[PDB]
Amino acid sequence: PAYREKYALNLRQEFPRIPFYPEFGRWAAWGRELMALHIGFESVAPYPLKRTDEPPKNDTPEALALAKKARLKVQRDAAKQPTGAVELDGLTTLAGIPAAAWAYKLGNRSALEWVLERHKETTPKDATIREKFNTYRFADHKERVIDLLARVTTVSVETVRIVGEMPAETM
Amino acid sequence: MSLQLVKKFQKRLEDIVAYGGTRNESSVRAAFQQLLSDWAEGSGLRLITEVTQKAVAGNNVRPDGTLKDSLQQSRGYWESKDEADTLDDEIQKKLAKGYPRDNIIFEDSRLAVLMQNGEEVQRVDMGDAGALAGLLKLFFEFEPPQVLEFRKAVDHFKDEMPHLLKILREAA
Ligand SMILES: [Ca+2]
């Protein structure tokens, strides 16, 4: 974190030059853990997330259809801070995400918010693909996402911890 | 009916967006309201607007208009939308709230969908008079299976009266 803060304007205009930090052993260890979590994010232990399920509003065939549509939104409080719940679709809602897991910010979006965004049903900009090759329904990918969100919750909380164990000063 | 009434509707839809400067549903609905109303008058039905019905869920829902009979019995419904919306998208939400589907004309100013017995029977373009006049014929004539079976029993008599008259003539 401190390297990213101090040399921020440098990082923004050049290739990231690497300091010769005192220990080395500790640093390459921290980086063996980090790379494991990031590469094998499909194999990390799923964090325990509480799945709660609600029935459709009525029994109209259209209610179910409209409720199987993806919302994938972080339920936030009035302070616009995550309440630790994600409304997956109108029926399934996963909860119990730790607050620290929202801090593995890869870009302007957290790791979890990236998984949610890239699994939403967005209309293809190309017309031909919109008309003929638009066959993604979140229903078919709901279970896989429930698993990925849990695995990435572990990646996020583990990364935030390893990054917090790092010194508070840059060579 | 048919051509005469539908062609007057086409001119009235134009007069509304021209003299009013609004293409909003609340203003442009008067055109199809008067088509459905004047057709009904001739078929012994009346289009009563904004009549609240209850769904299975218990949700009160008010279609733009219902086709009532002389015994206050609903026989068809109508919902108008503006041209500035996707008719098909508004259709799922409408029926999800608890809208009827036995006989309902979902209609925006450019396209008309007739849903009978729960399935889309016909989808016409309101620009084509003959096409709309066809869909409206099926809407105003859709009958519940009770009257469908009575009509069939009246036809049975047309080939049973000879057999019945023999018995009465033999008695006379
Ligand atoms: Ca309406």
Side-chain angles (χ1 to χ4, degrees), chain B residues 25 29 64 79-81:
Chain B
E25 169 209 338
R29 258 174 56 184
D64 274 341
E79 239 289 331
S80 189
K81 283 95 177 237

Side-chain angles (χ1 to χ4, degrees), chain A residues 57-58 60-63 65-66 69, chain B residues 57 91-93 95-98 101:
Chain A
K57 293 179 179 179
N58 64 34
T60 69
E62 293 87 13
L66 295 174
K69 293 179 179 179
Chain B
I91 288 170
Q92 293 177 335
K93 293 179 179 179
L95 302 156
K97 293 179 179 179
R101 59 176 71 183

Side-chain angles (χ1 to χ4, degrees), chain A residues 45 47 49 96-98 101 112 148-158:
Chain A
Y47 194 88
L49 292 188
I97 294 169
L112 293 157
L148 202 52
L149 270 180
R151 295 209 201 259
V152 163
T153 301
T154 299
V155 164
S156 300
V157 79
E158 285 305 284

